[PDB]
Design a binder for this molecule. Structure first.
Ligand SMILES: NC(=O)c1ccc[n+]([C@@H]2O[C@H](COP(=O)([O-])OP(=O)(O)OC[C@H]3O[C@@H](n4cnc5c(N)ncnc54)[C@H](O)[C@@H]3O)[C@@H](O)[C@H]2O)c1
Ligand SMILES: NC(=O)c1ccc[n+]([C@@H]2O[C@H](COP(=O)([O-])OP(=O)(O)OC[C@H]3O[C@@H](n4cnc5c(N)ncnc54)[C@H](O)[C@@H]3O)[C@@H](O)[C@H]2O)c1
Ligand SMILES: Cc1cn([C@H]2C[C@H](O)[C@@H](COP(=O)(O)OP(=O)(O)O)O2)c(=O)[nH]c1=O
Ligand SMILES: Cc1cn([C@H]2C[C@H](O)[C@@H](COP(=O)(O)OP(=O)(O)O)O2)c(=O)[nH]c1=O
Ligand SMILES: [Cl-]
Lengths: 322, 322
């Protein structure tokens, strides 16, 4: 019952850690949790402050690319949940190399070390962006990889590395793919926290192009619960989509955020569109539901409300990040 | 008309270079050819000896991972044909990291530099192994990526990086995928030259498992001619399969090689099978034929005969490599 969580000081990773330690995943027993995080601009020790008193938690400031470190930290580890990654599309367009480096090479290093340490199973956390764009309908686990951005191409490359580790060495690795997450502790470079915090700072909102692009949104709590279900009961080598997604154009979402804050359209500015911007993401989550029983439980309206309030009450957390 | 060929001191790359300089590709005019090769165990200056007197040829001993070097060597380059890679499956199973490093990160570096240098078009040379294994039938350009070995996963990751460079930055990159190549100057770690040279050395042949695995074989001359057709007339962002392949089980091929050398079955030994060994590869090459007019012109029987004779007459080349 010794687990290692990479990227556990980031947004999603920290939520998984806080929840696991809170006992929200009865089927994943945690006797000892090691968090490995290199603390890039996106990692934040404060995301784990609510649990730093936990005796079961060991925090390791280090890199997934460090084979030396992993060979030692993975001794006796039964399972790994891998969240560590460069995760922002805009950064990837501005400076792609670090995406290959952390995402593809880091994943290769981590999995090789897992094989050398005899780790039981690994959950590789991935994204819907690997599928490109979809005008109508939703993608299934058999949809083809047609990444458009360097970030998406790096995440797809890392999913291929996972497949090879399972096929060649017999590593029990499971892959999850999810839509856009939202919730407390999300870095303010991401759409929702960026727009909410700009508003709180009395600023404008940079809406790309026309705002017609479509994304599906899931509360990170639901995403993390699906990851725990896969950890506990998925099958080696399988891919699972974690749905939930309420589908919105960015325009309509912008409107919901303005309302949630008492603001108006005059706060929005239309900016030049993102290079190669994906028009629409939509994931079909029937497989995980039929196989593992997963269904989202946080409605957008409630989740979003709690999220906005969190930002309103935590300027001390986000201010420094901007 | 300035071209840069990465991996041009390797097997396929050197054949493309010798042919281009020989004028076999009238539609690809070569005023200046730069070859960039890091001379790993697989690169060999002697592969280019037949053309070192060519004034149009500039040989650069360097790495695709060296952004410094590329930023300068790519100045004024109109097109790149990218062959540089770690190419042996067995090496990839024994030591996977270098595959991610050269194949995925090296490709990312090269393409970024191509975008920064304003390079007109690039041909990214890939493989049928990205598709996994296929029991019956042949794969098309829309077949899904299901790599099984670290080598295949690294080549698929590099194909995804190519797609993203085209989708995000507008880079005119074309991808080719081919079956197993054979011919003069192939390194002796590969099946055919390994078996031919073992026989010439009076040794035995390590046939994996039962030898039932199936591969399609094409003479490198045909492969290179299809690459030149894609360079000259393919379309940005497209994938092209380069077929030819006469499909054989390794058992049947072994039998053909024994005969070509006057040997017999007593020279063959059955060895433990390769981890995650792909059972069968088969590529459909209708697209390149219908779109670009490509059809293989070297029959297996003649190509193979010339190849075996080449090994018989070039012990000075291969001996040192073993
Ligand atoms: N946020 C989303 O909407 C979304 C959707 C689906 C999938 N994902 C995937 O979920 C994962 C977590 O995403 P997130 O939004 O929490 O990201 P994030 O940017 O908030 O956090 C990433 C974390 O990884 C750490 N990290 C980065 N490089 C590292 C390295 N080399 N070694 C160790 N630690 C390293 C960072 O310090 C940080 O704590 C990523 O794999 C992402 O691709 C995210
Ligand atoms: N041989 C085949 O059957 C086959 C089938 C289809 C596709 N391919 C692809 O064709 C390409 C060439 O294959 P090959 O059989 O000629 O390979 P090879 O191993 O004979 O040659 C590879 C060449 O790349 C060079 N190289 C390696 N790493 C480098 C780096 N970081 N920087 C610069 N140069 C580097 C090596 O020195 C060598 O000259 C590869 O991309 C391979 O994946 C080969
Ligand atoms: C960050 C940002 C994003 N967007 C758009 C880009 C996407 O269509 C959507 C979400 O962007 P983002 O939060 O970057 O996530 P992703 O690119 O992974 O989907 O919001 C804007 O319009 N303005 C912004 O300032
Ligand atoms: C190198 C080698 C390969 N093989 C088999 C593995 C493959 O099925 C086939 C060709 O192997 P190889 O030349 O390594 O190429 P590839 O793995 O890219 O297809 O021959 C043997 O049986 N013995 C050997 O010694
Ligand atoms: Cl695919």
């Amino acid at each position: 019952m010794r687990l290692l969580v990479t990227g556990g000081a980031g947004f999603i990773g920290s939520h998984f850690v806080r929840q696991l330690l809170a006992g929200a995943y009865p089927d994943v027993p945690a006797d000892e949790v090691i968090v490995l995080d290199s603390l890039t601009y996106a990692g934040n020790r404060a995301n784990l402050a609510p649990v730093d008193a936990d005796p079961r938690l060991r925090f390791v400031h280090g890199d997934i690319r460090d084979a030396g470190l992993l060979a030692r930290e993975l001794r006796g580890v039964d399972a790994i949940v891998h969240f560590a990654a460069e995760s922002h599309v805009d950064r990837s367009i501005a400076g792609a190399s670090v995406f290959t480096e952390t995402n593809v090479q880091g994943t290769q290093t981590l999995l090789q070390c897992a094989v050398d340490a005899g780790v039981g199973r690994v959950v590789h956390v991935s994204t819907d962006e690997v599928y490109g764009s979809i005008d109508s309908g939703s993608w299934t686990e058999s949809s083809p990889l047609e990444p458009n951005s360097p970030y998406a191409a790096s995440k797809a490359g890392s999913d291929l590395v996972a497949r090879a580790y399972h096929r060649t060495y017999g590593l029990d690795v499971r892959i999850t793919r999810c839509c856009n997450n939202y919730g407390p502790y999300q870095h303010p470079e991401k759409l929702i926290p960026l727009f909410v915090t700009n508003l709180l700072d009395g600023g404008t909102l940079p809406l790309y192009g026309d705002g017609a692009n479509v994304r599906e949104w899931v509360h990170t709590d639901d995403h993390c619960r699906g990851i725990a279900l896969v950890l506990a009961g998925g099958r080696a080598g399988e891919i699972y989509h974690i749905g939930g997604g309420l589908e919105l154009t960015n325009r309509e979402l912008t409107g919901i955020l303005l309302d949630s804050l008492g603001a108006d359209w005059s706060s929005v500015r239309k900016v030049a569109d993102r290079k190669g911007h994906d028009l629409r993401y939509s994931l079909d989550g029937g497989k995980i539901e039929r196989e593992l029983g997963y269904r989202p439980q946080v409605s957008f309206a409630d989740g979003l409300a709690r999220t906005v309030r969190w930002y309103r009450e935590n300027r001390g957390w986000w201010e420094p990040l901007k």
